[PDB]
Amino acid sequence: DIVLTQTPAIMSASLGERVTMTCTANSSVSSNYFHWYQQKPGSSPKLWIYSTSNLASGVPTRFSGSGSGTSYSLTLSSMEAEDAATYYCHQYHRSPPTFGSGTKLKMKRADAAPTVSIFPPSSEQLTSGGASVVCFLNNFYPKDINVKWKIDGSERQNGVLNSWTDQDSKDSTYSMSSTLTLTKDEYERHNSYTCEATHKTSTSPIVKSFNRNEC
Amino acid sequence: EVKLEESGPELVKPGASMKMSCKASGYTFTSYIIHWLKQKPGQGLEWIGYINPYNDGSKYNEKFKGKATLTSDKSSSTAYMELSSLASEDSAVYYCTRNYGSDSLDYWGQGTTLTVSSAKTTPPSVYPLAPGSATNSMVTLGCLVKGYFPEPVTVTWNSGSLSSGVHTFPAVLQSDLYTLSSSVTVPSSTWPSETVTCNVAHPASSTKVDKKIVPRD
Ligand SMILES: *[C@@H]1O[C@H](CO[C@@H]2O[C@@H](C)[C@@H](O)[C@@H](O)[C@@H]2O)[C@@H](O)[C@H](O)[C@H]1NC(C)=O
Ligand SMILES: [K+]
């Protein structure tokens, strides 16, 4: 199980920029049995480069590969939006074949403020004895964001589930969902629920509120 | 067209075993080795072993030679992997893939999501997310998918969503139950005028949900 170390682990590139990523093996591996794969979130890997430098069917010509011995590289002459993905190297010089830890290549783009939307518990959920308040924070960049929940002015930290999408295929922004879940009894003891986002695009939080007396 | 079709997601209890399948079509099954690989969430790929359906010979990662047994059925052009004495760390997506020239992996199955856990298979509750009674040219709606186990769930929308207007968030586990959400942003002239529906499938429990996003009254 020959160790393959990929560097960098994470990197970003603007459109049109040259990108090179490397894979270093702990032992020498024949260039005929060195391959690269691309994987996008939620999908199977795709053969990208075979035997060091041959492009698989359908792979854009802006990609190339090179190397021998222990040092291999995948180069992208011009970063494009559809190239944001994780790339893995693979050696089959010996059994067992092994794969790299991956280089996650991201797309740099212009800053975008989150568009914030808040939703009260559905009448349907309220019959279950639970109550969730949901906040979407959509189409922002960069990924760095902080979300706070306030219940009648006091911060709530317990019962909050946050999840982030990876970069949108089209505009390359991130989105985030924040779900506050309480018991129905606890939910009905308060008036207003506020989700507050802090992001570099605004010195003020971007916020939305829902109050129970308005609905 | 070459296709590798894997069996569905499954939940298995600690200490039991799992057998999953990889159905090959569109080429001569017996002429190509099939590899089986493991991928944990947020990790790279780990090779388990291969099956040569020509001579029924399988080769194993030494790590897996006790736990894994790879077989094939020439009668149905199907390769199988059995994993025995399972524990929580066997939870992963498993791929079958075809060995091509110089042992590159050209065609891949869609993956089988295996969860090993003491928890119970539970179908999702799906809840509509509609704005509170308090509009812009665009309106965001959503659905909240709660209380299910195991992964995965799929969400598809019937809507007038705009460019980069659909976001389905990776599920988060809490206390043996998953929460997932999905948002859709549509022009405000399309809703509540035209019907918007969140369609959720949970293959592990053999359930679906077709939830209409109704405005709050
Ligand atoms: C594999 O290599 C890792 C990185 O070490 C560096 O690169 C290798 C190829 C050598 O040139 C070494 O002198 C370098 O410092 C190691 O961190 C790792 O321990 C190695 N793994 C094993 C199992 O030996
Ligand atoms: K319905």
Side-chain angles (χ1 to χ4, degrees):
Chain A
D1 19 334
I2 296 167
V3 173
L4 301 177
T5 298
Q6 285 189 256
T7 59
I10 305 167
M11 68 193 300
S12 292
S14 296
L15 262 48
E17 294 180 350
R18 184 174 191 75
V19 173
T20 294
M21 61 186 74
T22 64
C23 176
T24 292
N26 289 42
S27 289
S28 48
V29 297
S30 161
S31 55
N32 286 334
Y33 301 92
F34 199 92
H35 319 298
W36 297 83
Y37 303 78
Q38 184 199 74
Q39 191 178 33
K40 301 206 166 156
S43 299
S44 302
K46 297 180 195 195
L47 184 57
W48 213 248
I49 300 185
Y50 71 92
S51 301
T52 301
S53 58
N54 303 285
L55 300 182
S57 198
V59 169
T61 53
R62 55 177 180 284
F63 288 91
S64 56
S66 51
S68 68
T70 72
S71 321
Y72 290 86
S73 62
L74 183 156
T75 302
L76 175 50
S77 62
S78 178
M79 176 70 194
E80 304 311 337
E82 76 202 36
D83 306 334
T86 301
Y87 294 82
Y88 296 115
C89 54
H90 167 212
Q91 68 84 26
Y92 219 144
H93 184 59
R94 318 204 77 74
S95 194
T98 56
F99 297 79
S101 31
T103 291
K104 191 178 180 173
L105 174 65
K106 307 185 291 162
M107 188 184 141
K108 287 196 168 73
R109 53 144 291 146
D111 288 354
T115 296
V116 176
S117 295
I118 193 167
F119 305 85
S122 57
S123 57
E124 206 168 4
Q125 185 180 21
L126 290 174
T127 65
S128 77
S132 293
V133 185
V134 177
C135 187
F136 293 131
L137 304 92
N138 283 340
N139 299 79
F140 63 88
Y141 187 92
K143 195 177 187 174
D144 306 283
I145 196 167
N146 188 275
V147 177
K148 272 204 219 317
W149 283 92
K150 307 297 190 63
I151 298 172
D152 300 327
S154 285
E155 185 178 359
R156 175 69 181 199
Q157 295 188 338
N158 281 287
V160 177
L161 304 179
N162 294 327
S163 183
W164 274 264
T165 53
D166 219 314
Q167 287 184 288
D168 184 87
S169 291
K170 196 228 75 201
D171 76 0
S172 297
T173 60
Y174 295 92
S175 291
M176 177 190 188
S177 178
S178 190
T179 304
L180 173 59
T181 301
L182 303 172
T183 66
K184 171 166 175 170
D185 308 74
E186 181 59 25
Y187 171 68
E188 294 195 348
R189 286 170 203 146
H190 311 289
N191 186 239
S192 91
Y193 293 82
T194 301
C195 64
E196 301 191 9
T198 297
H199 191 253
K200 70 163 289 201
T201 49
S202 177
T203 59
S204 283
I206 301 140
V207 316
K208 288 287 194 298
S209 299
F210 166 81
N211 35 320
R212 290 191 33 242
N213 58 342
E214 294 175 354
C215 178
Chain B
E1 185 185 33
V2 172
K3 286 177 52 46
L4 300 175
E5 286 176 84
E6 292 183 69
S7 42
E10 192 50 274
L11 171 58
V12 177
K13 292 280 156 285
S17 299
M18 173 61 183
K19 185 187 266 182
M20 62 181 68
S21 63
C22 172
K23 205 297 192 210
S25 61
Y27 71 97
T28 303
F29 183 59
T30 52
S31 289
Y32 293 82
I33 286 167
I34 291 169
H35 300 279
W36 289 90
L37 309 99
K38 179 175 177 185
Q39 188 175 41
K40 290 185 191 186
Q43 289 188 10
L45 292 147
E46 186 178 22
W47 182 82
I48 299 162
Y50 78 63
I51 183 67
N52 184 339
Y54 194 87
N55 61 17
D56 305 292
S58 53
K59 182 75 187 184
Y60 299 84
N61 186 334
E62 286 259 353
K63 178 163 169 191
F64 287 92
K65 72 180 174 189
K67 173 171 277 172
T69 302
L70 309 175
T71 51
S72 64
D73 189 15
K74 186 193 198 168
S75 310
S76 63
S77 296
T78 302
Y80 304 88
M81 177 166 73
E82 172 193 301
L83 296 177
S84 73
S85 294
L86 296 175
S88 71
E89 306 95 327
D90 296 301
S91 302
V93 177
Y94 292 87
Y95 295 103
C96 67
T97 181
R98 190 176 76 160
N99 189 71
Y100 204 52
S102 324
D103 312 310
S104 55
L105 311 175
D106 65 338
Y107 288 94
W108 290 69
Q110 84 281 13
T112 292
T113 303
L114 178 63
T115 304
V116 187
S117 171
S118 294
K120 188 145 177 276
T121 291
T122 313
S125 300
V126 176
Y127 303 123
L129 305 177
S133 304
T135 318
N136 188 47
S137 58
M138 303 275 264
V139 61
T140 302
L141 312 166
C143 65
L144 176 58
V145 184
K146 274 181 65 50
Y148 72 89
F149 195 78
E151 283 270 76
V153 131
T154 57
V155 177
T156 57
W157 283 96
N158 310 343
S159 87
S161 65
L162 290 315
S163 81
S164 306
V166 192
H167 305 292
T168 293
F169 300 90
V172 184
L173 185 60
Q174 183 169 56
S175 302
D176 301 327
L177 296 173
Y178 283 98
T179 299
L180 175 145
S181 62
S182 188
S183 76
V184 72
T185 300
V186 308
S188 49
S189 72
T190 71
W191 184 90
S193 171
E194 308 207 62
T195 287
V196 168
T197 297
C198 157
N199 303 102
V200 178
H202 182 232
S205 67
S206 207
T207 56
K208 300 175 186 184
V209 182
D210 60 305
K211 190 60 55 176
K212 182 171 154 155
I213 314 310
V214 68
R216 300 175 65 77
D217 199 279

